[model samples]
Target: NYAFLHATDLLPACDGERPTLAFLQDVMNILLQYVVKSFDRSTKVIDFHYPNELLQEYNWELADQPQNLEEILMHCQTTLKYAIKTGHPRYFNQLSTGLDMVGLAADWLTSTANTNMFTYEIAPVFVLLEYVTLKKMREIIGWPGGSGDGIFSPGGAISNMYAMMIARFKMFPEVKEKGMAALPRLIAFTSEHSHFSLKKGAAALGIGTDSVILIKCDERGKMIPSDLERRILEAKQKGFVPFLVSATAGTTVYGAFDPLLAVADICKKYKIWMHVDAAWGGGLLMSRKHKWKLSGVERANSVTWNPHKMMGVPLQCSALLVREEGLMQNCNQMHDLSYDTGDKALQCGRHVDVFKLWLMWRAKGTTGFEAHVDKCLELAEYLYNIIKNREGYEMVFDGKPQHTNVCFWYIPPSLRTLEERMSRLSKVAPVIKARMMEYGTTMVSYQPLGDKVNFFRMVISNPAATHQDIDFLIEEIERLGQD
Candidate 1:
């Protein structure tokens, strides 16, 4: 048997010599044949078993063993056979779907460079790209003189956490060194339908989750301005300091958008920081017609916008924009002698993730993005109309849609009787969901809103999706429910 190779024994001088391109071409031909044959054979053997069998078995440990390139490739091929094809048109399980060709190419180029974003010395081009992209985002947010500062966080949740930290810092700059002890009881508010990150952030900051108030929303899941005012006054009366108000532009469960104009006014009156969690619906800002959904958003103290959710960018592309300049730097920047070189500046290392975003903006331009957004909203409307008018389906919310999310429940034919319709509809929701998943033709999500459980919570963000796909989803639900 061949011995496992170690770096010490496989040094460049000891490895004999580098092979020529002709030798590489011969290896490629064999690999190509192997890949094609393996894929063809494995497709038929693949199974879709729920509660996967591997989890029940014990794990294996590898001894000091050598694996050839062909063996490694075979493992990868087997994994692919079990993995769901996200690129397939039928897969609609998540907000992120369907790969963009432009984004795919940019990812390839980005990996080729493989540079860190920490400082200009190591990543000059990436730092400048991030600077330029951030400035443009600031301008779009209506920051005068672009005085506001921002950064590209790992995701929307982290960006939201950063927003909470910055808001706290802005309120009490001394808390960084002294901790939350410097501040009195701090209260932040978000709607019941808002993302759970706010509560998580509150917990992480040493402010108990109880400090985060769950404000009541209206029938459409949008926060009622009067309710917010009432809550603020109640908190003040209870001697809790109202510090931040998180206005959700697009809610996660129902795709409802809160009244930004009303919320912004209340935030100004109370002198509290306002942050808009537009992680889901911010992409509508690109659409000329739908941008009104976020009317008065310009007045927010800070905003969290994620292109990865709606704009179809790859994972981990979210930004936090602040209205005031240097606030982020003032709050999060740490200067230590150990990590800094004497000759270099304090801001030495940063990220280079902005290139793909810049390239996307350049490729789509403002108008292109607007067109894509408008079409998605239109598709959502199309779905809503079909489900609402259909015999066995009912809408969850009363009013018109605020964004590109349509939630409804399909009432099976057997449960359509007038006397038992409502009660039976509730029982069939879970059954229908399970049947749909088993069919594997297409996938959708389900959740409970208040006391009611709904079958469909469909979101349309993919530019490739058409009205026909929307119709197909409706038909699939009906067919699965019937069976």
Candidate 2:
């Protein structure tokens, strides 16, 4: 019934209050319905449409004229209609999974506030929340009394890049002024299985991607400490500066944790900076059961911990924690009101990314987070147990998972026990995955790593999922690939 109601008729205009309230409530109702549908197992995870089909199905182009409130409401519904329900019990796609209700509410509030994180004058409460939340994260990272420096960056990639920058600054403070010309050829080492962002970080810092050494990983994908030391010494002998050793707390495909203790020892012996990319596995720090995997993280000079990945925080909430206070300030300071936090970041006006996390933390206390991590790990373990011994399935790696990543290949009846199965097996996951997207039943990630063929990388970060959902995923795979 919102016919011909233009933007001019909404809010701040004469007699606009009622229309504004009604229009907003209508939008909220639509959003509320979508949120409720997102968690329902019976609902399809996505209403699948190809790129061309979607473009043709909807008039997505901008118009010179404004649309009425009725069309606006319809647009909202249409947008959500084709959206992926990442919160679905069977949507096992990305590192960041699930949606926390408290976090969602806080996100809505954050958009409403619409303030910059630059200064306290603009974002008083947000600035304080950032400080408090970051301090707590540092403390959880095993820093002494949560006394350290950090900033909530855009994502894990940028956080990893920030760590490289800070590491370089710590080694040579003059690089900021003199540029890379004055500095020697710097070297950074990470596991072969570490996120590609480390190479991205190196290239962005003018160190060149070739300067970033790829240390070997064992069969389980954990970084080999012996290989790391060898690489470091080789770099040192070559007269290159051994600047940083980025340990992967969670490798992307295998969910591997590098031997942080051993890497820390090597770093200590050589006086190199240790940075842990715990973006994917950092949430395990909250879990008493799994925190041991990230041992010696406290010894690292810097850490990249992303709450968005594992802790069920909303998207774009990753923090780069540093052991030494004032390093980030010294590195990124253009000029802080002691309270204005924007100076510590590269960007002038940063988005307020802390409130959703802080509010979620408040809603679900530390114990709540611990439980969440533990539960997701448990679910991963359950999936591993099911597929590890089952017929027509082969695990990409042996043994129980270090994180909530179950990488495996689902072999159809025809491909089972075949000698030259390698080539044909490689095609299976992609076909099944395509069929899955078409059917819109469930979603999971798959990729080829090194010599390994295309295999399903089933991550269980979604709290909405269950044992039944796991069973359904397996059955769905077999059903789709039965031929």
Best by lDDT: 2
Alpha carbon deviation, residue 299, candidate 2 (Å): 0.5
Q: Each model's TM-score? A: 0.87, 0.98
lDDT per residue for candidate 2 within 1-483, as digits (tens), equals 588699999878998999999999999999999999988888999788989999999999999988899999999999999999989998998888887899999999999999899889989998899889999998998988998888999988999999999999999999989999999999999999999998998888899999999998889998888988889988889899999999999888899999999999999999999999999989999998899999999998989988888988889899999999889889887545799666687888788789999999999999999998999999998999888889988998776799999999998998786776789888988999889999999999999999999999999888898999999999999999965
**Candidate 1 residue lDDT tens string, 375-477:** 8788889887777788988888788777778888887777666673556666666776677556556667787778776556788777667777787788878
Q: What is the lDDT of residue 36 in candidate 1?
A: 44
The C-alpha lDDT values of all candidates are 0.74, 0.91
Off by more than 4 A, model 2:
none
- In Å, residue 200's CA in model 2 sits off its true spot by 1.0
To one decimal, what is the Cα RMSD in angstroms of model 2 from the true structure?
Answer: 1.0
